[PDB]
Design a protein around this ligand. Structure first.
Ligand SMILES: CCCCCCCCCCCCCCCC(=O)OC[C@H](COP(=O)(O)OC[C@@H](O)CO)OC(=O)CCCCCCCCCCCCCCC
Ligand SMILES: CCCCCCCCCCCCCCCC(=O)OC[C@H](COP(=O)(O)OC[C@@H](O)CO)OC(=O)CCCCCCCCCCCCCCC
Ligand SMILES: CCCCCCCCCCCCCCCC(=O)OC[C@H](COP(=O)(O)OC[C@@H](O)CO)OC(=O)CCCCCCCCCCCCCCC
Ligand SMILES: CCCCCCCCCCCCCCCC(=O)OC[C@H](COP(=O)(O)OC[C@@H](O)CO)OC(=O)CCCCCCCCCCCCCCC
Ligand SMILES: CCCCCCCCCCCCCCCC(=O)OC[C@H](COP(=O)(O)OC[C@@H](O)CO)OC(=O)CCCCCCCCCCCCCCC
Ligand SMILES: CCCCCCCCCCCCCCCC(=O)OC[C@H](COP(=O)(O)OC[C@@H](O)CO)OC(=O)CCCCCCCCCCCCCCC
Ligand SMILES: CCCCCCCCCCCCCCCC(=O)OC[C@H](COP(=O)(O)OC[C@@H](O)CO)OC(=O)CCCCCCCCCCCCCCC
Ligand SMILES: CCCCCCCCCCCCCCCC(=O)OC[C@H](COP(=O)(O)OC[C@@H](O)CO)OC(=O)CCCCCCCCCCCCCCC
Ligand SMILES: CCCCCCCCCCCCCCCC(=O)OC[C@H](COP(=O)(O)OC[C@@H](O)CO)OC(=O)CCCCCCCCCCCCCCC
Ligand SMILES: CCCCCCCCCCCCCCCC(=O)OC[C@H](COP(=O)(O)OC[C@@H](O)CO)OC(=O)CCCCCCCCCCCCCCC
Ligand SMILES: CCCCCCCCCCCCCCCC(=O)OC[C@H](COP(=O)(O)OC[C@@H](O)CO)OC(=O)CCCCCCCCCCCCCCC
Ligand SMILES: CCCCCCCCCCCCCCCC(=O)OC[C@H](COP(=O)(O)OC[C@@H](O)CO)OC(=O)CCCCCCCCCCCCCCC
Ligand SMILES: CCCCCCCCCCCCCCCC(=O)OC[C@H](COP(=O)(O)OC[C@@H](O)CO)OC(=O)CCCCCCCCCCCCCCC
Lengths: 69, 69, 69, 69, 69, 69, 69, 69, 69, 69, 69, 69, 69, 69, 69, 69, 69, 69, 69, 69
């Protein structure tokens, strides 16, 4: 596909924000949720799942650009 | 069918945008939704479903042109 | 990614609070839970798991910044 | 981390209560449980485990402040 | 720690009851258990263990106050 | 806080009933439950837990007034 | 607390029944359970535990009235 | 306590059956168990324990009525 | 922010009631719920959670004023 | 964009009220809702979500001014 | 309050029926439900809960008249 | 209460059926369930519980009429 | 506010009926609903909620007169 | 604005009635609705919402006079 | 009770089947289970328990008719 | 069946990815899960099950093409 | 029935696609789901169920043509 | 299979981390668990099992690449 | 493998603590357990096993780094 | 290893108590056990084993510090 056009700025902003401040806020939210739900049931596997989700978000732009040319 | 006519430009724009900036914006939206809903309930299966939907969108023009000659 | 923008202040507050007062409150909550659940079934392994979770929270900002540039 | 902020009072109360009246109540609960479960199966090792848990609670604030700056 | 506060009365009651009527009831329960289990297998070592547990309960408040300031 | 106002009567009634007839009914309910569940599995520890809950209810008004000024 | 009010009759009935017909039915149930489970594994300690539970039920009203004024 | 009321008939039936047909069936069950388990390991002490349990059942109503007035 | 204006009286009333009669009524409601749900499943951890919620309500005005200037 | 014009006063009032008395009233409403819904199901995660929403409201004017120049 | 007026007859009928034929029908329904659900999972605690609900219904008119003068 | 009225026939039918054909069908159902679940895990205690439930059903009308006048 | 005027009689009637015959009818309706829904799922907590609602209705006139002068 | 003029009497009457007899009638209507809808689904949160609406009505004149000079 | 009515045929069928073909099938199932579980752990006591259960089923109709008139 | 058509590209991508990067990511996820859950309960049988699942995925395309011609 | 008509082409396409590219895509989806859900809970029975579903899809056209002539 | 594509980076990161910092953290966790559970029950066989699991993790990438081409 | 990355600090802390204060605490715990269990059954072989476990912990980092490159 | 850190105080307390009051209490316990078990079977070899265990405890800190640097 083409990255430019009438919606090029929106796509650029969303792609940059996926690994930018909103993405970091979401990742911190998952970290806080893992810490909170581990108070009664300590489970560090959810931390690994959160790290994997962060890795997926880090590669989200690449995946989207690969699937949608 | 025929790709030209009075509505040929609209069809061309929509087909190009399916894998263009609007399609990439929608895919980034699904990625953001997967990241957000994984804060409380980490689920990477929805990421696989999102990737499959992106693959379907990448082949949407081919499917439409195959069904509608 | 970029730490600034419209959501830079929210990200800064969340990152500082991960090891700040809310994070310390959550850690004290896990300590209280470990103490309480050890009344009937004394288990100091959950204390080690809680310490590991505290260590993970101490490095949460670094992990998030590493995954999300 | 920082001990002050909007949640500074909650953190201060929880840290003081870890070795305060609630912590002493929990420790007395473990002592009562050790005494009760020793009626049929006298086991003074659980008393040592309870003392170790009390020692951990006495150092809980230090551990939390060390892990979370 | 501090013995006063919202939970000061509960802590005072529990500490007084550790060597009070509930503690004496538990100690009498261990004595009855030692007498009963000695019908088929006479074992006076369990009586010594019960006496040691009673001594521990007599010093439980001191231990709790020493560990939790 | 303030004990008076439009909701002062409701607060007074609830605080008096916490140690009044409804609280005594709830405590008798826990006693009945302890007696019933001890038919198949005799467990006098639940009686101690029930006594501790009764002690907490006896101090519930004090705790609420201490936390909420 | 106060024994009268809208719930005074319910509290009176429950307190009287704790040592009345329902309490005697529950005690007979524990006696039947002790007799039945002693067919394969004769254990008279459970009879002592049942007697202690009956003694606790006999003093349940006093304990409730002492904790809840 | 009071033997009458809505549950008086149930209490009367249970008390009469403790030394009635169900109690005799349970006692015969213990006798059969003692005879069966003595085939490989002849042990007449379990017969004495069974006789003591029968004596306890014979006095179960008296014990229940003494504890629960 | 500013505490005055057309809605200053409403904000003042709500902030005072957070630790006033309505807040005390809600806290007594949580105490009653903890007592009631402990009849069948005695759990004193919910009492600790209720105390933590009361502490949060005691600092709710401070948190709101800190976040919203 | 431009903050002045025929609608400049309305925009100024709304932006000031986002962190002013109406915003504080809404935040107190979320605190009251968290306290009320925690009576039956104690959940302190909703308190964290409410704090995050308060933080978002504190930065709402900045986000709006960043997106809309 | 006042028991007379335009709605006095309806209130009288409802209060009399609370312990009358409709109330007895509802109580028999709970007895039937307890008997039916005990076929697969025999549980006599639900019978005690049903008896307590019947006792509450017997005092429902008194409670209503006490709360609503 | 009163046994007559518009719902007197329904109450009479339900009370008669509690010990009539539907009650006997339910009791036979519990007997069948006890026999079936004893194929893999022979347990005659559930038979005693079923007999107690049958005794309760036999006195259900008396209990209902005693609680609801 | 003022209790008199063209609508003074309507306000007086409604305030008197809040704790009068209509209010008692509504309270009896909640009691009937609690009894009915407890046939399949015995829950006495809803009875406590109904009692709290009755207490609120008993103080409804006071609350209305306090808020609306 | 100005409170006098040809419509000054109408404005005065409406402002006085907002907290007068019509406002009290409306508040009693919300109380009756909360009581009625709580018969099947007991919900005391709607009572809090009604109290907040009453508080808003108590300050309605102030808000109107602040917005409209 | 009465054996006739709308449910008389169902009761007759169930009572006849308790000692009929379904009851014999269940008894054969217990015999097969005893034979199978005795392959690794030969235990003829379970055969005695199965015979006692068969005897109980043979008298199930009599017990049901005695309890439920 | 036929591998071509409008959906031929999607089928080709999914079949290649079953043993490609997504399949390898899933297999690494199972390896990580086996390693993590073996920290507390070391179990190498789950590793064998994971290897069998990897073997099944390696033959998944063949199985699908065999069943669906 | 008849395979021809106005809808003959649609029926032919659907029947061919049941074992064609869409059916293979669905089967690959079940394989991916089995692989993914086996990361935390390795279960190869779901693979057998998926194979059975693939076999059913392979015979779906035959079943449809047999039922609908 | 193919190691490249849209998910090539995720696969590379996971494969490198299997023997990298996360894998070493998991191995240290198993070592800590072996040391902790050996305090009461010294068992060095679990150390051998942990070493075997570490060896399996060291060869996990090779196994995955062998099964999934 | 690589010792650095987002999880490098956690790995460094865990490796240093294996032979640091937590490891020494665990070793002292095994020494205390050996001393305590030797009161009734003096066994110095468990001391040798504890020394071997301490030696294994001293080489745990080397083993982990050797297996996981 | 390092003796300081978040767990330095716990390690210091445990090391000092190994030869302190708890260690002396354990040694006195072994002496009492040796004296008691020598009543029927006088054996002074167990005294030598106890002395060797005391010597091991005296050197426990040195051994732990030597193995764990
Ligand atoms: C006041 C005295 C000092 C506090 C003493 C105890 C503190 C509680 C911790 C020990 C309880 C352990 C046994 C629990 C018994 C139990 O079953 O708990 C159940 C309850 C619900 O937790 P989850 O939602 O994880 O549970 C789901 C199910 O378990 C429901 O039962 O757990 C908690 O709420 C405790 C965690 C709160 C701890 C984190 C608090 C920090 C976050 C909030 C910070 C403030 C937010 C402010 C926003 C403005
Ligand atoms: C009044 C007389 C003095 C008290 C005497 C006994 C005190 C109880 C301790 C010994 C019982 C041991 C045998 C138990 C038998 C048993 O099975 O218990 C079961 C019960 C449930 O505990 P968990 O939820 O850990 O158990 C889950 C399963 O075990 C359920 O059975 O344990 C407790 O509640 C005891 C711990 C409370 C002790 C900590 C209390 C301090 C926290 C609360 C402080 C106040 C909060 C105020 C909030 C406003
Ligand atoms: C009435 C006559 C005087 C009492 C005579 C005997 C008293 C019982 C002691 C000897 C029995 C020994 C053989 C037991 C045979 C046996 O197997 O017991 C089993 C039973 C269950 O105990 P655990 O839960 O420790 O056992 C778990 C498993 O052993 C289950 O079998 O043990 C007890 O309940 C006895 C301890 C109660 C003793 C402590 C009572 C004091 C706490 C309660 C104080 C009142 C609370 C009031 C709350 C309102
Ligand atoms: C009439 C004879 C004297 C009463 C004898 C027995 C009383 C019941 C207690 C022992 C039963 C134990 C075994 C239960 C078996 C069981 O499974 O129960 C289940 C039932 C439901 O409780 P939860 O909702 O906690 O349970 C959720 C799940 O467990 C559902 O199964 O528990 C209760 O209702 C008992 C608690 C009521 C006790 C508190 C009553 C006081 C509050 C009401 C006061 C009056 C309100 C008036 C409003 C106008
Ligand atoms: C009719 C003949 C005379 C009765 C003979 C036997 C009576 C039963 C006692 C011995 C059985 C022991 C072996 C059981 C075998 C067994 O596994 O039982 C399981 C069953 C379920 O009890 P729980 O809910 O404690 O058990 C949970 C799990 O154990 C489920 O298996 O226990 C009972 O129901 C027995 C307790 C009832 C005894 C208390 C009855 C008094 C309360 C009701 C009073 C009337 C209420 C009226 C309301 C209107
Ligand atoms: C028909 C021939 C005459 C009977 C001969 C033998 C009778 C059985 C006694 C000796 C077996 C000993 C070896 C058992 C081998 C064995 O392992 O048994 C296991 C089985 C299960 O008992 P528990 O639940 O105590 O065992 C739990 C675990 O041991 C499970 O294995 O024990 C019984 O059921 C025997 C007790 C029944 C005896 C009491 C019966 C009276 C109560 C029922 C009265 C009728 C109720 C009617 C309700 C409507
Ligand atoms: C009169 C006697 C003294 C009161 C005794 C009991 C008080 C109730 C608390 C314990 C019940 C626990 C078991 C409940 C059983 C249960 O399932 O409850 C269900 C019911 C509905 O709550 P939610 O909407 O959270 O539940 C949604 C679902 O759970 C529906 O079932 O919970 C409540 O209403 C209780 C909370 C009220 C407590 C807060 C009251 C304070 C707010 C109102 C203040 C006055 C407003 C005035 C406005 C003018
Ligand atoms: C970044 C560091 C390297 C990763 C380290 C760890 C990786 C995680 C595996 C071990 C965690 C084990 C303990 C879990 C603890 C646990 O309870 O997990 C719960 C969580 C939810 O799984 P389910 O939905 O099967 O669980 C349902 C319930 O278990 C909810 O708790 O499991 C997973 O998400 C792990 C499986 C993901 C593994 C497959 C990932 C590959 C698919 C995605 C590929 C990318 C898609 C891209 C789309 C664009
Ligand atoms: C690295 C150094 C060379 C290895 C040295 C030792 C190897 C371990 C054998 C001796 C330990 C004996 C004492 C154990 C102490 C012990 O209690 O073990 C407990 C542990 C759990 O086994 P189970 O599940 O049979 O035990 C259930 C309960 O025993 C739990 O305690 O046993 C094993 O895991 C050992 C068997 C693994 C041996 C088979 C491994 C081959 C299968 C895996 C092949 C690779 C799969 C790859 C998949 C991708
Ligand atoms: C690749 C190397 C060669 C394989 C080596 C090992 C093969 C695994 C067998 C030994 C593991 C034993 C220890 C297990 C440890 C263990 O706990 O396992 C747990 C796991 C779950 O089994 P269940 O669901 O029976 O277990 C329920 C609970 O046990 C959960 O833990 O068991 C299996 O999956 C093994 C059975 C699969 C064996 C049957 C496979 C054939 C069916 C599939 C055929 C293909 C379907 C294709 C569909 C398209
Ligand atoms: C800070 C001091 C240094 C750490 C000391 C101890 C470390 C803990 C290991 C020994 C505890 C053994 C006794 C446990 C007592 C126990 O019962 O544990 C229970 C707890 C829950 O584990 P599972 O979910 O396997 O257990 C299910 C049930 O066992 C629940 O009880 O186990 C763990 O969490 C320990 C495994 C974590 C170890 C792996 C950590 C590496 C993965 C995370 C890496 C970071 C992720 C970052 C994401 C951003
Ligand atoms: C540091 C000083 C040099 C070591 C001196 C002594 C070494 C210990 C041998 C003699 C003790 C004999 C009396 C024991 C007294 C005794 O009762 O022991 C009990 C203990 C438990 O063994 P089992 O599980 O066979 O016993 C089950 C029951 O006996 C439990 O009591 O035995 C061992 O652990 C000793 C065998 C370890 C020897 C094999 C070690 C090699 C495998 C581990 C290699 C490293 C793995 C690294 C993984 C990363
Ligand atoms: C204060 C005085 C100095 C301490 C004296 C005694 C220390 C205890 C050791 C000897 C007791 C032996 C007899 C026990 C009797 C017994 O049965 O214990 C049972 C208890 C439970 O252990 P497991 O979970 O292995 O046991 C499972 C079953 O055995 C449950 O009974 O064992 C321990 O907790 C002792 C191990 C703790 C030792 C390791 C502590 C170091 C890890 C924690 C470091 C701090 C974490 C901080 C996190 C922030």
């Amino acid at each position: 596909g083409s990255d430019d056009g009438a919606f090029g700025d929106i796509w650029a902003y969303m792609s940059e924000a996926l690994t930018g401040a909103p993405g970091k806020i979401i990742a911190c939210g998952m970290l806080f949720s893992v810490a909170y739900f581990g108070v009664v049931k300590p489970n560090l596997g959810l931390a690994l799942v959160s790290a994997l989700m962060m890795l997926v978000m880090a590669n989200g732009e690449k995946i989207i650009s690969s699937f949608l040319n």
